[PDB]
Every structure is written in C-alpha cells, then in structure tokens.
C-alpha cells in the first residue's frame with residue numbers, strides 16, 4: 001500500500017493545483033495578516049462547517065449544497081476579526097481581473113467571485129488597536145498565491161493569518177499537513193491556530209495532537225519524547241508570567257474572542273454534500289489537538305475543498321469516503337501540531353506569547 | 362381592538378427606535394445604492410433566514426441562536442452583488458467610531474461590530490459594469506440613518522439598495538409597511554425587491570400582493586380595482602418590448618442572479634430563536650407577493666429584529682407569538698406591493714424597466 005505517508009512537502013499544496021499565499025504586517029504596531037487558499041483554474045467544489053459563528057464570516061451561505069454556485073476559486077483566512085473581512089474585497093477584485101467567478105454575462109469578463117472568508121481575533125497584539133488587514137493586504141495574499149508553482153512548500157508559523165495568532169497563551173500560527181491514501185488520493189489541511197483552549201496537556205506538557213502524528217514527522221523540530229517534570233513546571237510558570245504581563249499590557253485579561261480557522265482539501269472527487277460532511281468531520285481533528293474547543297466564544301470554522309481530479313473509486317463508495325473523512329480529521333490534528341511547533345515567540349506592547357519550543361525544546 | 366391598522370407612517374420606523382438610511386448613485390453610468398437599518402442604542406435581537414445563499418452575504422453565521430453575540434446594531438442591504446459587500450466595511454468602521462459593537466476590552470472604545478449584510482444583483486444597470494457600492498457609500502447610508510429622528514417616514518422607490526432593483530422586468534425598489542397588533546406592539550417590514558419572478562398575475566395584471574393589503578392603504582397610488590383586458594394586453598406588450606431592448610443593451614438576456622432582501626422588525630420582545638422563526642415565516646409573505654420565488658438562482662434573504670421594548674404578553678405565549686409571526690408575513694407582502702407601486706421607470710444604457718404604474722395607472 002502507498003498510503004499512510006505524507007505528500008511531498010507534508011502540506012496543503014500536496015493536493016495538486018492548490019496554491020497558498022500569505023501577506024502580513026509586523027512591527028511599528030502591527031502583528032497580523034491574511035492567508036489565501038487558491039484553487040486551480042476552474043475552481044474547486046467547496047463546503048463549510050462553522051461552529052460558534054461570527055463575528056467574522058463571509059459568504060458561508062453560498063456554500064450550502066442547495067445553492068446555485070457549483071465551485072469557488074479562493075478561501076480567505078484573515079486576522080483583524082470582523083474588520084479583517086475587508087481583505088476579502090481585495091481578493092474578489094483580483095479574481096474579477098482574472099476573469100474567475102460565476103459567469104453572469106455572455107462576455108467572459110463578467111463574473112461574480114464567491115469568496116468565502118473567516119476572520120480570527122488578534123486585535124492590538126502588535127500594539128496598535130486599529131492595525132487590521134484591509135483590501136490591499138488581501139489582494140497581496142492572493143497575488144502571492146498566484147505567483148507560486150504547483151506543489152510549492154507552504155510557509156508555516158507566524159505568517160499570513162497566523163502572524164498574530166495565539167493558542168492557550170502560547171504563540172500559535174499557520175500549520176499544515178498531508179497524507180496519501182491507498183487509492184493514491186491526497187488529503188491535506190492548513191490551520192490558523194488561535195484557540196482559547198490548550199494544545200498542551202496541563203498534566204504533562206505533551207502536545208495533545210502528537211499521538212496522531214505519522215511516524216517521525218515531528219522529528220525535525222527537536223522536542224524530547226519524555227518531558228521532565230521540572231521542565232514542565234518551569235514552562236507552566238513562564239506561561240503564567242507571560243499571561244499576567246500580557247493582561248497588564250492590554251489593560252485587561254485574555255481576549256473574549258478566539259478560534260481556529262482551517263481549510264481541508266483533497267483531489268478525490270466529492271459532491272458538495274460530501275465536502276460538507278468532510279468539513280464537519282474535520283472539526284474532530286481540532287478536538288483531538290486542542291482542549292477545550294468549540295466554546296461559546298470560539299469561532300471555529302473549517303472549509304473543505306475538492307479539486308475533483310480523482311474518482312472516489314478508481315458499500316464501496318461509503319468505504320472510500322470514510323477513508324477521506326477519517327484522513328480529514330487526522331490531517332487537521334497534525335496541522336495544529338505543526339502550527340504550534342513552527343511558531344516562534346513574540347513580545348510586543350500588545351502581548352507576550354512564548355512558543356512551545358521556547359518552553360519545551 | 363387597536364390592531365389591524367398601520368403604524369403612523371406605515372413603515373419600518375414605526376417600530377420605535379429603528380432608523381433607516383439610504384445612499385445611492387444615479388447617472389453617469391451608475392444606478393445602485395445601499396440601505397442600512399440601524400437599531401437603537403443597545404442594539405436589537407437579530408436573526409436571519411437565507412434561501413438561495415450567496416453570492417452576497419456576510420455575517421449570517423453570527424446570527425445563529427447558539428452563538429455568543431446577543432444583539433447587533435445594523436443590517437446592510439446593498440446593490441453590487443458580492444462586490445457590494447464592500448459597503449458593510451464602511452458601516453463597521455462607523456459603528457466602531459460610535460463605540461457600538463461587541464465589547465472586547467475594559468475600554469468602551471474597543472468593540473467588534475457584527476454587521477450582517479446581503480447584496481442584490483444589479484450589475485451594469487446604469488451602463489457601467491464596475492459601478493458598485495463601496496465602503497464610502499455604505500458609510501454614507503448609516504450616517505444618513507443616524508441623522509434621522511425616531512419615527513421618521515422611510516423613503517420608498519428607487520433609493521438605496523432599491524436604486525437598481527428590477528422585479529420580473531418591471532422596475533422594483535424599496536418598499537415598507539407596518540401593522541399594529543391588538544397588544545399594541547408593532548410589526549413592520551422593509552424590502553428591496555429584485556426578483557426573477559413576477560409581482561403581477563400574468564392572467565389579469567393584478568398585483569399578487571394586493572389582496573393582502575389593509576383597507577385603503579394603496580389608494581394614494583391611483584390604480585383601478587378592475588384592470589381592462591386591453592390595458593393588460595398593452596402592458597404585457599410594453600414589458601416584452603422593454604425586456605427585448607434590455608437584452609440587446611446588455612448583449613445577453615436577463616440576469617441569472619436575482620432576489621428580494623428584507624428586514625422585518627418588531628418591538629415585541631423575542632428570543633433569538635423566536636426571531637429566527639419570524640425571519641423564516643416572513644418568507645411566506647414574499648411568496649404571496651411574487652411568483653415564482655426561491656428559485657435555484659434567487660438569493661432571497663430576510664433579517665428579523667426585535668427591539669425588546671414590549672413583553673410578548675402584557676398556550677398564551679404561543680398565541681402571542683403566532684400573532685407576530687402571521688403579521689411578519691403580511692407586512693412583507695404589503696412592503697413588496699409598496700415597492701412596486703412606489704417605483705418609477707428607468708431607461709439607461711444598461712436596461713429599460715418601466716414601472717407598474719407607468720403600465721397600469
């Protein structure tokens with residue numbers, strides 16, 4: 001069997017034709033950005049599962065299986081909470097210029113791009129409250145995506161929508177992971193991890209998601225299998241210190257708004273309803289990596305994409321879809337772990353957030 | 362009984378504290394605009410029922426009854442299809458400046474405005490394809506709303522989001538209607554009518570919604586109870602002529618995207634779930650005014666608001682809510698009829714759309 005191994009770069013672009021672009025702003029009061037997932041020409045079948053709603057979603061109704069539009073070209077993940085939805089307008093503008101969207105005239109230039117977006121809360125984490133992504137930053141992200149070749153490695157860590165992301169007080173960020181199925185199809189995820197809950201078991205210091213990893217995939221990051229009690233005691237103290245200092249700097253504790261945004265993708269052909277099921281099932285992967293999740297205040301959103309390049313079968317259909325559904329959860333769990341490990345700490349007038357590796361590696 | 366009569370101006374602002382603002386652009390290639398419904402200080406309980414999705418919705422997930430945010434301050438209705446969602450960013454900016462939104466810091470200036478929006482398709486109807494509402498036009502609409510006193514009459518016709526609206530080939534627009542309940546509560550609707558279907562019975566020329574009118578409310582518009590067969594024959598011919606000319610001018614037939622946007626409001630206190638039921642039930646009012654509705658390509662969206670100023674009871678609760686639910690459908694039916702009657706025809710390089718009264722009055 002050829003399955004159970006990561007794709008070439010262990011990331012979202014291992015789904016052929018998918019491109020990812022980041023644009024960010026750091027320094028001078030800023031710590032935010034935008035990540036765009038760009039489908040190949042012709043678009044991708046897309047669905048969404050939102051748990052905890054807005055503030056900060058756009059065009060989610062368009063992704064209902066009953067609706068007219070059958071594919072989309074781009075999903076926008078952004079900082080800036082509801083304000084950052086402004087980034088999506090810049091992406092829609094770019095798509096129009098490219099002639100990419102729902103056709104609304106005999107002239108191929110006349111199109112309406114359906115651009116779903118979800119935003120995470122990172123306000124003030126650079127120091128300046130009104131420092132949020134705008135249309136220009138959104139445009140920059142999709143232009144960055146378009147400039148990449150197929151199968152290009154995805155940058156992880158404090159980039160794009162992950163720039164200002166924080167998970168349980170630790171620095172969060174962008175992470176990605178993939179897996180090849182025995183059928184040869186690839187399933188992959190990209191996550192911007194900004195959760196209220198913890199990626200770390202408070203009893204041990206072990207990352208919750210680590211036991212879902214594929215053999216050896218995290219070895220390059222350099223964290224021991226066994227974490228010493230003294231190391232974990234020290235890490236907990238440092239995190240508590242950072243949290244108290246952050247609360248002082250923000251003139252108030254920890255954000256009431258938090259979340260994880262994600263895109264799961266595959267080249268296996270899915271109907272919209274099957275993609276909607278995949279988006280829903282991928283939330284399980286988040287639960288296995290972070291605890292607690294899906295709180296009242298947590299705006300967790302997963303988009304699912306199919307490029308429709310491989311038939312599900314190269315109850316047999318159910319079995320094939322179950323493989324994709326199970327992989328969808330696992331790649332999201334793994335992407336969250338990668339985000340946490342890829343992050344480097346920050347220290348700004350808007351927050352002090354050390355990374356996992358700064359505490360445990 | 363004091364019920365079964367319209368409120369003071371027969372419109373949405375008969376719900377005390379509600380304000381409505383329009384901003385539009387006409388001429389020089391333009392025929393579009395934005396309508397904002399602004400809740401009183403402290404916000405309103407809000408819900409939504411979307412049928413036919415996007416392209417062109419924003420922050421609808423935030424209105425789910427499970428979610429954190431308990432009230433909102435503004436709903437944005439806009440032209441420009443998905444591009445026009447850009448208008449909502451301007452409204453969010455204004456709300457932030459006013460300190461109005463979900464509180465996210467001990468400082469009252471730190472807020473995240475939840476601004477739901479829905480867009481209708483009017484592209485190119487002024488002549489210029491890229492002539493769509495932007496953030497500035499959205500800001501202008503909410504500023505216009507804020508400048509009005511309570512209980513101010515709502516302008517109808519080709520204004521705000523109704524500027525470029527077309528219903529079954531006839532000029533559409535903004536319409537509004539209200540009714541007082543025996544309890545003393547008011548229920549009202551505002552509609553931007555842009556449907557694929559017809560407001561007019563093709564067999565007779567009679568407006569479908571007219572028989573839902575309250576006694577005498579349409580008398581000021583001057584259309585006979587009995588429409589002559591010859592008048593109706595002439596009207597049908599003129600509409601067909603306008604449709605064929607429009608198709609020539611647009612280098613292609615009639616838009617694939619159409620809809621009706623609406624806001625229903627009441628001062629009776631509703632939970633979010635009760636408001637969601639009201640939004641769903643109000644769609645029935647649309648069905649009674651327009652046929653067909655809710656087609657695959659029709660993006661019909663109804664927002665429902667409660668200002669929470671009157672108790673439902675001043676199974677009794679069910680009976681009181683049923684009165685509100687029934688009124689919600691009726692005021693929407695009536696608002697659609699008002700939109701059709703208030704409209705005046707247009708003739709631009711992007712379309713020829715006569716009004717109902719130009720054909721039948």
Ligand code: EMC
Pocket residue numbers: 054055056081118119120121257258259260261298299300301
């Ligand atoms: C801040 C909820 Hg994605």
Ligand code: EMC
Pocket residue numbers: 415416417442479480481482618619620621622659660661662
């Ligand atoms: C054009 C669908 Hg509100």
